Design a protein around this ligand. Structure first.
Ligand SMILES: [Cl-]
Length: 280
């Protein structure tokens, strides 16, 4: 009668996580919106449901929905919460899980104290792969803003589009004024996640991200990937980098020609139970 769930977050990107292997529930778009509501519902950035696999080689399937009920994720943190969750719920004893997702097979690696290592795929850089309006691929690009202000950006696609600019001080960066101008720039026809990176040294950076359609967020994981990859391409960063997001720290590893590896934390906040009827 009652749906059990777990509230989790990854550096403040917060999830409602539901075992739909030992449970069954009908969750349409409106029900997800009602559950997501911070005042009337559970309150979450995304909903993650664990489901029986469709293919014999997967241990699990999952799907991730936004607060408005659409099946979308911008930052790629949910995979880490998933890997922790199936362990915490005793759904498996394996720490190298094979999971079927909307992007194919993923094999997250759960380690110590809730940290999870994730294959984030290959970065893409060509303008038409971002998408970004530019005649030729370059190392950096000048982007024109309002009132004759310009910034230098690098572009990366991690499945979603990113533009990374380097600032001397992440605390004083004009994210509120510059972010919207980048995120909706005419040169980004599908909009873009705008990252503002301060380089502390070759192994440590700080990063604020103005996310597409959202604004500044605590923990854009693909944005951390894009910033670290960009700093490596510019010859500023080593091939393993701690990125301090607004929500906390995680690690990015990359070498040109290989995939990006992200190792990030997870947090178990509380276990809950609710009567789904009051939300359907
Ligand atoms: Cl421009």
């Amino acid at each position: 009668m009652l749906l059990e769930f777990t509230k989790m977050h990854g550096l403040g990107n917060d999830f409602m996580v539901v075992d739909l292997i030992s449970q069954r529930a009908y969750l349409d778009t409106a029900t997800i919106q009602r559950l997501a509501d911070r005042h009337f519902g559970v309150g979450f950035d995304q909903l993650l449901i664990v489901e029986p696999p469709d293919v014999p080689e997967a241990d699990f399937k999952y799907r991730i929905f936004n607060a408005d009920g659409s099946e979308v994720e911008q930052c790629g943190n949910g995979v880490r919460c998933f890997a922790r969750f199936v362990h915490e719920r005793h759904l498996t004893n394996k720490t190298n899980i094979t999971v079927q997702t909307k992007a194919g097979i993923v094999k997250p690696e759960l380690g110590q104290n809730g940290w999870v290592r994730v294959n984030m795929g290959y970065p893409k850089f060509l303008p038409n792969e971002i998408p970004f309006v530019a005649e030729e691929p370059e190392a950096l690009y000048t982007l024109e803003l309002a009132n004759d202000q310009n910034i230098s950006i690098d572009v990366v696609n991690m499945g979603n589009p990113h533009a990374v600019t380097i600032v001397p001080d992440v605390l004083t960066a004009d994210v509120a004024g510059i972010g919207p101008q980048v995120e909706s720039h005419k040169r980004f026809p599908e909009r873009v996640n705008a990252g503002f990176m301060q380089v502390i040294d070759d192994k440590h950076v700080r990063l604020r991200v103005f996310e597409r359609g959202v604004g500044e967020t605590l923990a854009c994981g693909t944005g951390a990937c894009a910033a670290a990859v960009s700093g490596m391409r510019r010859g500023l960063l080593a091939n393993s980098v701690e990125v301090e997001l607004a929500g906390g720290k995680l690690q990015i590893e990359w070498q040109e020609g290989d995939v990006v590896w992200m190792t990030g934390p997870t947090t178990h906040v509380y276990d809950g139970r609710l009567d789904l009827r009051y939300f359907q």
